[PDB]
Amino acid sequence: MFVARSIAADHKDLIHDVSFDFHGRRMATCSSDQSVKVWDKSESGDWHCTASWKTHSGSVWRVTWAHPEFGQVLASCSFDRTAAVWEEIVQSHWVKRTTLVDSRTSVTDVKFAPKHMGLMLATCSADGIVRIYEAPDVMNLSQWSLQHEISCKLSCSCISWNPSSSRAHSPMIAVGSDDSSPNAMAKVQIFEYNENTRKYAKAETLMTVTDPVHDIAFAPNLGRSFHILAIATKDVRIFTLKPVRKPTKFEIHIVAQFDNHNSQVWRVSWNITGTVLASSGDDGCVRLWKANYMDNWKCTGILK
Amino acid sequence: PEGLCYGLFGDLAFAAKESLVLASSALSVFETMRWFVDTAERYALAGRPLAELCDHNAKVARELGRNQVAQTWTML
Amino acid sequence: DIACLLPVHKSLGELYILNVNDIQETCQKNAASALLVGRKDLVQVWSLATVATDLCLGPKSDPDLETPWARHPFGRQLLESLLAHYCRLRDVQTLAMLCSVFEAQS
Secondary structure (H helix, E strand, O other): OEEEEEEEEEEHHHHEEEEEOOOOOEEEEOOOOOEEEEEEEEEOOOOEEEEEOOOOOOEEEEEEEHHHHHOOEEEEEEEEEEEEEEEEEEEOEEEEEEEEOOOOOOOOOOEEEEOOOEEOOOOOOOOOEEEEEEEOOOOOOOOEEEEEEEEEHHHHHEEEOOOOOOOOOOOOEEEOOOOOEEEEEEEOOEEEOOOOEEEEEEEEHHHHHHOOOEEEEEOOEEEEEEOOOEEEEEOEEEEEEOOOOOOOOOOEEEEEEOOOOOEEEEEEEEOOOOOOOEEEEEEOEEEEEEEEOOOOOOEEEEOO | OOEEOOOOOOOOEEEOOOOOOOOOOOEEEEEOOOHHHHHHHHHHOOOOOHHHHHHHHHHHHHHHHOOOHHHHHHHO | OOOOOOOOOOHHHHHOOOOOHHHHHHHHHHHHHHHHHOOOOHHHHHHEEEEEOOHHHHHOOOOOOOEEEHHHHOOOHHHHHHHHHHHHHHHOOHHHEEEEEEHHOO
16 A cells, blocks of 8 residues: 655646656656656655756657666757757756757657667657658767658657667657547557668558547556557557567467446556556556456556 | 656656636655565574574565465475 | 386285374375385475465465465376376376376365
């Protein structure tokens, strides 16, 4: 039974994302008033705000941390059609580094690549373009290059990398649509990197999903041989992407379908180890789910 | 309207606007893997014969509360 | 006397014990009997039986609480490999004892 300790953000508008860094002791909150705040943990046991500034000229949708190896780095996307990267310089000096200005309509998601292939960053766009950036000189955070670009021919609203760290899973990305088109076109797609053509290629498409998608999240691997994906369209869903022995061909399966919310599910997350999954619907409650060694997922807690 | 995140210590951060819990939102951290740390500290990996290492690891596993883990060491 | 060729030994058969009241009690005695008979295979398998039946790993009621010991690759797969080995060796003295002990453990 968790204890819900509330903190006063004092944001002048809504809050759109919260993110813990790498160690569970600092969080970053993005709001809709062009501000990003940072909260650190005290030995007393409470969060106090240690930094706040004006980031963009629109509405900040997401803020994500990077690996501590590359430094204390943050990224943010906004309605002003940009994306930024910040670093903390020692008091609380947060300095702007770059401004990725290639977009044309808007940026909805921003995510750092897993920190085993460089300092790479992927940004979505409401027009339907997913762009992947890179920084060959790990230490200059002012030099970012554009390596690939993917056109998915549909509105883009979410993104999530593959954290699998093995030398048997070519890096792959997952994008989610939000188009309320009358036709039942698939709204989740998967792209994978081919080693010999130096180009991202479509791997598989989730045809069974014909409803708008609001969040996409992979599950951390930590030694499994297959992959797990969670989608929050209107009920929480969990898929499986076991491959075939040697693009690559996956055999997709459906493992969960949970209409417990009786509303629209907005965002999801995974615990630390792909054992518990969180959810957040319009009813205002969080819910946790877990497996039972028969692959029979079931609820394991309700939090208000 | 909302945003979620987990943490290394099983802390859940949930933010949602005060129309589902309309121009402001409220958030709280829910203080919902301790065995990992003690298992990492107390284990032994070299400097003793194989039997002594297995016995020590089995004793540590038993004292921590997991017996199905403890008996594997003894069987090995 | 062709007892040198048979897979079953009478001397071991006399000294066995089988107590449902305390399963762990009988396995050490059987291990000692195997030690004093001259078969190291039996001492190893009876040692595994001792360390494989401790009450601490008895099954629970709700499946969601924890995985049963039986699904561990040492409970139902080690036992099923030893059973197949002894069937191939065609030794119905260890088969009956192992089956009886593991069944009465339930």
